[PDB]
A = this chain, B = another copy of it.
Amino acid sequence: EIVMTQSPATLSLSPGERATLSCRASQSVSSYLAWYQQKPGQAPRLLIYDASNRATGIPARFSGSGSGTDFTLTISSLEPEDFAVYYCQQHSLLPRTFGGGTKVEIKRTVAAPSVFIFPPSDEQLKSGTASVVCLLNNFYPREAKVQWKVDNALQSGNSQESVTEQDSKDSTYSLSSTLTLSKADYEKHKVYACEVTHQGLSSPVTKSFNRGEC
């Protein structure tokens, strides 16, 4: 059970020069591991098969080194179709541990989320529930906060968030914490504010409404 530690946790790079990646082993694998291309929603694909040697139709730019503890994966000529979660994985020891995950993002600039809270529908009040949805939209990076305020009461646990993938078009993100409440706790209050703290935001943006306003 040799722990494989990938030294870049994630990476963001606007498409360009060498974007070399790293994975370390807990022991001496000695050039007996492989590199992988798990694309989002896809089957993984072999990049490097034994610490180098550029497996079977890999285009021009995906060398790597190692031998035998801390291994490298050189993304030299970035080619932005290659934005995928990458994986070192030892093989010549059982059981066969994978790496951690090497989500390669894009580094445009830090942008502000266009924050949009949404009341639950009256159809949801016909369902006897209430889910307040606070948008974040068209921003960078994912490093955000949502602090729900229920007549200005800092609440969580009733709220499930939702992270879009990074867009191919504008490299942005979109969040939605979903403050799912009962209808009874919904009727107890009106001021439903959503304190959103993001780096592109200068302030913790509190997007609010009143129960029955919109």
Q: Could you list which residues of chain A lie within 8 angstroms of chain B, going by C-beta atoms?
A: 190, 210-213
A-B contact pairs, 5 of them (CB 8 A): A190-B212, A210-B212, A211-B212, A212-B212, A212-B213
Interface of A is mostly: loop
Residues of B with C-beta under 8 A to A211: 212
Residues of B with C-beta under 8 A to A213: 212
Quick one: closest B residue to A187, CB to CB?
A: B190
Number of copies: 2
- Listed from nearest, the 5 A-B pairs whose CB atoms lie closest are A212-B212, A212-B213, A210-B212, A211-B212, A190-B212
Residues of B with C-beta under 8 A to A210: 212
A210 vs B211: C-alpha distance in the bound complex, in angstroms? 11
Distance (Å) between the CB of A191 and the closest chain B CB?
A: 11
A212 vs B210: C-alpha distance in the bound complex, in angstroms? 9
Distance (Å) between the CB of A190 and the closest chain B CB?
A: 7
Distance (Å) between the CB of A107 and the closest chain B CB?
A: 46
A150 vs B119: C-alpha distance in the bound complex, in angstroms? 24
Distance (Å) between the CB of A183 and the closest chain B CB?
A: 13
A190 vs B211: C-alpha distance in the bound complex, in angstroms? 11
Residues of B with C-beta under 8 A to A212: 190, 210-213
Distance (Å) between the CB of A174 and the closest chain B CB?
A: 30
A48 vs B65: C-alpha distance in the bound complex, in angstroms? 125
